[PDB]
């Protein structure tokens, strides 16, 4: 049980890491640059997911 | 067999900003009675505060206005480090000559605007106060320099200016005329020699943190049903509950032992909800064989 | 006014020990029945931090970084320091920082600062109507270009005369994060004849100021030339360091409990395995 417990939460703490974006949360991502700038950094995030 | 995976859409979106209450005199410029004169132009210093620009420009109270680089809409959710303004008095035909980039007889010799410069211009008619019978000399303007003012620059200093070249010393001599002349206000005039009150709104963008922005418009708050909520700290969808949680009066959210968001509290008025994703899953259908029937 | 005390002398920077002392919330989140890790500027467990006191021939004021944080501790009776002196330069040639407590609120101003050679607080004519009110500001003679300024929350002192043992406890952790100056306090009751108490104890932000300027020393404002002596207060300075504490949060939100990582080595384990009780093993 503790093994599958640092499975899942180890899975859930990875939303929190940054991934070498500008943050993890992807709406401030959308809400400031532009698209095509935009781009680069949400596949660098969704890659690393 | 699952064949899809179902999630219940939000109804609708949900935003709620802290109060903007205990505004600061922003229109202080905008209500003043006398301004200064063109070279003598008033800088307003506006730190940690909140300006309405709703009312400034929505609302159509005043003559005209004309933005550059950003629309009047697009004001609400962006800003920048520092705001001025910049009150002065100047005539009708004067009006074109206050635009970035642009050169004039007050543009270059009394106010110039930068080349980048993202703020607006405002005007509206003065002539039922600035003017009076006989003509109004307290205002001035500097009709001759022999250099071009900085961009931003403010000079009170008085002088005579010298055409040629001639030992004038506290006279008018030959090629010796005044710098400093009084404007020819009076009512009678037409629209062109009408007074104008432009004040100018000059934004700063620096390393430094933003303190000046616009308003902050907020919704009315739905409870037990899946919404997108964003209270003026982060984005996310749930299903919004009033709960038995404490929290301390400095804490807006809270997070659960995953580092995810189950608890935020109104930057508005003083409630505490857990917040709860929305529900979803599996679709999983149950089918006999093709060949023995269709349930 | 130009000419020093006779009695002045620098003292020597003295070390004391703390025990629990640095521990703060470090950010606004709520979370209960956990332990949490944070790396931020914190002040070391079990450290050195200076000792001073001011009495009625012993004077200390030195000069100190404010670089790398420093941390506030004031225990005193009737709470007589109102405030401190923060700068760069610390005169009128760049911008200067003063929290300043008027006994009514709070009042923060960063302008040019022309500095007198010898600030001073008093009270004068007090024969009727005292009411011990703040009449004369002796301490600047003149400020000019502000930049900024704030006035807080309102916050209650009385400076009638008491008996018995120490009754507050002021400890005050300032700091710079990307500009932003962050104020924290913890104010509780206790019974201290001398040196600390034994306790644990959190310390609260009050304010989160955006300013964003440089300040590269610090000073504590002179409050109560030979017959001029100073009143009786002490006070300590800590220095914050990127540390790491594994803080335990009650069912309430409050921390009851902090391990400071690279202090000891059982204590690296126990950030580790993020648990307070290690178990038996290697």
Known sequence: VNQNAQALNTLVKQLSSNFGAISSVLNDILSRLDPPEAEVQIDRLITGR | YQTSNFRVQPTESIVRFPNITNLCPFGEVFNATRFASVYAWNRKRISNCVADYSVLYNSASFSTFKC???????????????????????????????????TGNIADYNYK?????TGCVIAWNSNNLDSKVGGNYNYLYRLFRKSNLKPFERDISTEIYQAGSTPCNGVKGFNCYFPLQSYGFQPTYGVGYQPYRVVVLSFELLHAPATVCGPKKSTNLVKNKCVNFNFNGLTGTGVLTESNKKFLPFQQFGRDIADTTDAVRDPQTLEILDITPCSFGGVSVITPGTNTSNQ | ?????????????????????????????????????????????????????????????????????????????????????????????????????????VVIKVCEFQFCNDPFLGVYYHKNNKSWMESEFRV??????????????????????????????????????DGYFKIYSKHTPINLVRG???????????????????????????????????????????????????????????????????????????????????????
């Open chain 2, 68 to 102: 550059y680089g950003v629309s009047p809409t697009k004001l609400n959710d962006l800003c920048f480090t520092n705001v001025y303004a910049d009150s002065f008095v100047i005539r009708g035909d004067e009006v074109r000559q206050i635009a970035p980039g642009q």
């Open chain 2, 113 to 117: 605007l930068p080349d980048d410069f």
């Open chain 3, 1 to 105: 006014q130009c000419v020093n005390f006779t009695t002045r002398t620098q003292l020597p920077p003295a070390y004391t020990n703390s025990f629990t002392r640095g521990v703060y919330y470090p950010d606004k989140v709520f979370r209960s029945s956990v332990l949490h890790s944070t790396q931020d500027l914190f002040l070391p467990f079990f450290s050195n931090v200076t000792w001073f006191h001011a009495i009625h021939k012993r004077f200390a004021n030195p000069v100190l970084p404010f670089n790398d944080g420093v941390y506030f501790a004031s225990t005193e009776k009737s709470n007589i320091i109102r405030g401190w002196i923060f700068g760069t330069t610390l005169d009128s040639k760049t911008q200067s920082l003063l929290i300043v407590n008027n006994a009514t609120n």
């Open chain 3, 140 to 177: 600047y003679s003149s400020a000019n270009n502000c930049t900024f300024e704030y006035v807080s929350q309102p916050f209650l002192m009385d400076l009638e005369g008491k008996q018995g043992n120490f009754k507050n406890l002021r400890e005050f952790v300032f700091k710079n994060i």
């Open chain 3, 196 to 282: 600390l108490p034994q306790g644990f104890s959190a310390l609260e932000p009050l304010v989160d100021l955006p300013i964003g300027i440089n300040i590269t020393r610090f000073q504590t404002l002179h409050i109560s030339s030979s017959g001029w002596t100073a009143g009786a207060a002490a006070y300590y300075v800590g220095y914050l360091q990127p540390r790491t504490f594994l803080l335990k949060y009650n069912e309430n939100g409050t921390i009851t409990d902090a391990v400071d990582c690279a202090l000891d080595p059982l204590s690296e384990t126990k950030c580790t395995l993020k648990s307070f009780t290690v178990e038996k093993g290697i």
